[PDB]
Amino acid sequence: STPSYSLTPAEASAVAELTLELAAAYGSFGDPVLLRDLPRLAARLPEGVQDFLREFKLADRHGHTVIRGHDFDQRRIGPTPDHWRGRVRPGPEFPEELLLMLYSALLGEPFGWATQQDGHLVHDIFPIRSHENDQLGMGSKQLLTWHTEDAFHPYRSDYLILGALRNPDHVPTTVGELDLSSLSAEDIDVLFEPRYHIAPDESHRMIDERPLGPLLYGSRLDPYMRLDPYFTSVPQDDTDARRAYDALFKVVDSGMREVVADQGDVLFIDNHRAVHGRLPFQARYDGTDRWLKRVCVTSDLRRSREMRATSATRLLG
Amino acid sequence: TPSYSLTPAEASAVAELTLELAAAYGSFGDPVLLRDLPRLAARLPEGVQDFLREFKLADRHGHTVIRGHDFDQRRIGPTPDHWRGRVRPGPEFPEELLLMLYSALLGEPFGWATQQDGHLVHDIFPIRSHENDQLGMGSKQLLTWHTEDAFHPYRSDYLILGALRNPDHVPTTVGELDLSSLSAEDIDVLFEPRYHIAPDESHLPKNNTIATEEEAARFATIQRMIDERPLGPLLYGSRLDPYMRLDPYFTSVPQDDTDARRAYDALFKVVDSGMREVVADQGDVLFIDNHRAVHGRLPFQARYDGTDRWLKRVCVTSDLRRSREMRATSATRLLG
Ligand SMILES: O=C(O)CCC(=O)C(=O)O
Ligand SMILES: O=C(O)CCC(=O)C(=O)O
Ligand SMILES: [Fe+3]
Ligand SMILES: [Fe+3]
Numbered sequence: 001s002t003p004s005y006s007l008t009p010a011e012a013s014a015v016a017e018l019t020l021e022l023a024a025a026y027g028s029f030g031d032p033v034l035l036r037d038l039p040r041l042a043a044r045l046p047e048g049v050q051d052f053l054r055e056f057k058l059a060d061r062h063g064h065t066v067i068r069g070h071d072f073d074q075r076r077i078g079p080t081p082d083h084w085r086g087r088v089r090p091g092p093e094f095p096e097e098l099l100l101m102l103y104s105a106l107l108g109e110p111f112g113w114a115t116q117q118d119g120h121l122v123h124d125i126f127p128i129r130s131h132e133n134d135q136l137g138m139g140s141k142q143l144l145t146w147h148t149e150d151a152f153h154p155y156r157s158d159y160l161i162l163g164a165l166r167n168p169d170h171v172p173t174t175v176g177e178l179d180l181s182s183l184s185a186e187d188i189d190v191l192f193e194p195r196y197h198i199a200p201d202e203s204h205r206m207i208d209e210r211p212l213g214p215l216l217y218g219s220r221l222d223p224y225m226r227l228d229p230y231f232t233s234v235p236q237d238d239t240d241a242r243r244a245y246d247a248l249f250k251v252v253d254s255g256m257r258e259v260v261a262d263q264g265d266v267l268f269i270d271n272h273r274a275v276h277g278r279l280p281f282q283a284r285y286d287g288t289d290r291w292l293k294r295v296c297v298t299s300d301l302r303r304s305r306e307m308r309a310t311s312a313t314r315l316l317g
Numbered sequence: 318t319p320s321y322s323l324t325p326a327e328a329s330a331v332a333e334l335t336l337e338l339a340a341a342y343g344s345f346g347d348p349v350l351l352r353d354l355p356r357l358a359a360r361l362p363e364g365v366q367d368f369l370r371e372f373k374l375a376d377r378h379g380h381t382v383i384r385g386h387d388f389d390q391r392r393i394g395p396t397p398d399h400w401r402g403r404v405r406p407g408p409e410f411p412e413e414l415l416l417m418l419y420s421a422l423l424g425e426p427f428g429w430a431t432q433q434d435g436h437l438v439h440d441i442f443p444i445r446s447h448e449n450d451q452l453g454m455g456s457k458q459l460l461t462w463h464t465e466d467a468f469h470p471y472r473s474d475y476l477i478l479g480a481l482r483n484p485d486h487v488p489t490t491v492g493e494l495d496l497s498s499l500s501a502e503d504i505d506v507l508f509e510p511r512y513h514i515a516p517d518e519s520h521l522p523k524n525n526t527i528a529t530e531e532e533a534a535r536f537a538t539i540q541r542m543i544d545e546r547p548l549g550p551l552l553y554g555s556r557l558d559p560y561m562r563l564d565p566y567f568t569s570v571p572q573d574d575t576d577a578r579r580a581y582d583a584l585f586k587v588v589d590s591g592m593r594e595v596v597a598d599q600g601d602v603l604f605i606d607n608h609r610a611v612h613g614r615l616p617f618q619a620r621y622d623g624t625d626r627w628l629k630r631v632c633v634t635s636d637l638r639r640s641r642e643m644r645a646t647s648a649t650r651l652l653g
């Protein structure tokens with residue numbers, strides 16, 4: 001159903017060794033030299049892994065893929081943290097952050113948001129006690145709402161990379177693609193027109209902030225999507241757009257799949273071909289909870305220049 | 318302008334790599350070659366990779382050149398009389414592969430379905446029958462400076478020009494934007510949507526003739542530009558170090574917009590007067606940032622005897638997926 005790649009022990013050992021070597025060689029990501037070297041360093045990954053990801057990227061066909069069987073040394077990585085703030089970067093799991101950064105260079109360029117997790121290029125995803133009953137990344141008890149990442153945003157991620165340091169209770173990530181066959185030729189044409197408002201999140205000078213846009217784009221035979229139901233509205237008078245939006249929602253909602261990122265899995269989500277979400281789970285808060293790392297990938301770093309403080313920064317805002 | 322000069326050791330390494338890859342791969346008709354390009358480019362000398370990566374990330378200079386490649390003249394052979402009908406791959410396939418590797422370090426090579434048989438690597442040499450045209454296979458006529466496809470939302474992000482030969486040292490003109498010669502008020506105007514940049518009709522089926530529903534959709538966005546004549550900016554990105562898109566021939570400054578006229582003239586003078594002659598000599602590879610520089614080519618006299626100036630050209634996009642609406646399939650790298 002969805003292509004994936006399973007590392008041999010030899011590949012897993014090569015990758016682990018590489019990330020350890022790299023971690024000892026470079027300070028943190030605060031080293032501009034590491035960010036420079038990223039694509040060259042990523043060419044030291046096993047060739048089969050490079051070829052698989054390049055095929056996924058170019059095939060432009062599936063909403064996600066997974067590289068399975070990485071060796072994520074649990075003792076070295078240590079206990080899942082209580083919070084991301086006040087925590088020292090780099091931590092003992094730096095090799096794994098570096099792994100995801102190497103992967104982000106094979107896909108495009110890593111970038112981040114200056115006001116998010118202190119502007120770290122690699123984000124943490126783990127249950128936080130205080131942020132518990134909020135439906136955000138560091139939450140536990142809720143979600144239920146799949147999304148394109150930053151659907152409102154002109155420079156939103158092209159891909160997301162999620163590396164599962166641990167997932168002992170097999171908590172799924174929801175991911176859903178667009179099945180076009182349940183959708184009429186007329187509704188598709190409407191969804192391609194700029195007839196919808198996608199509002200910004202409460203996360204995030206110039207803003208900017210204004211127009212109305214499409215939900216579907218790219219090829220009409222195999223469309224890309226920007227879908228965030230919670231933040232999306234249709235002017236009341238546009239009954240055709242509302243009709244087509246209703247049909248789109250029903251098709252995407254009913255096709256959502258549960259994708260479990262297990263320990264040693266790296267999940268790649270294509271932000272144009274899939275929406276994703278997370279499901280509620282009871283956290284333990286003992287230091288053994290689900291811990292993912294996350295890196296956002298842009299195909300074209302220069303396109304977001306106007307929202308970046310300098311030419312060199314990869315942080316928007 | 319920073320440039321990189323290869324040592325004889327680096328040139329030899331680059332040459333040997335391109336000959337090895339030419340031997341291992343069929344042609345560019347192999348989709349496996351296209352998949353492998355960025356990994357193959359990691360086999361280039363490290364100093365070259367570091368240099369281009371710095372150029373790309375610095376986002377500061379509008380061109381750069383890597384000088385001193387070994388382009389074996391006896392192997393490459395005579396400059397062709399036409400691009401049409403040639404046996405592929407040609408004996409110059411290693412130099413074509415070289416540009417392709419460079420293109421993978423900058424982004425993705427792409428082309429245009431109606432240009433040079435859809436080849437990803439273009440030829441630039443004089444064709445007798447084109448002697449009187451203002452185009453790449455011309456000679457006698459000046460090719461006036463331009464951003465490549467200024468009108469086009471999926472225009473090249475970079476251009477790569479490799480000189481297989483240039484015996485008379487014909488310059489490629491290249492010009493950047495000295496921001497310090499423009500008033501803050503002029504800059505503000507250039508950033509505003511006040512200018513019309515007309516689509517070059519050679520990109521479009523000029524025909525308002527419905528050859529399939531599929532084809533019409535591939536050109537609808539450009540057709541909308543022609544139909545609606547949106548006004549757009551000439552400068553964009555950062556106000557302090559802006560990108561620009563400038564093709565004077567296709568640009569219309571609206572008659573009544575006095576301020577836009579004043580701003581444009583000042584911009585045109587700054588760019589025109591800053592133009593430089595960049596000679597891409599044998600074994601040079603010239604890299605043009607299509608957001609930070611305009612380019613063109615000076616008149617010259619062709620001999621049509623197999624000894625003429627011969628460049629190869631690869632256009633680069635930072636985001637192949639952005640142009641999906643204009644490509645026949647997900648897999649194809651050709652717009653139109
Ligand atoms: O925790 C997950 O599996 C996904 C969270 C998410 O939506 C995101 O990180 O964008
Ligand atoms: O021949 C040259 O040096 C440049 C011609 C040109 O304008 C181009 O290839 O885009
Ligand atoms: Fe998300
Ligand atoms: Fe966001």
Ligand SMILES: [Fe+3]
Pocket residue numbers: 463465612613
């Ligand atoms: Fe040109």
Ligand SMILES: [Fe+3]
Pocket residue numbers: 465466517520
């Ligand atoms: Fe053109």
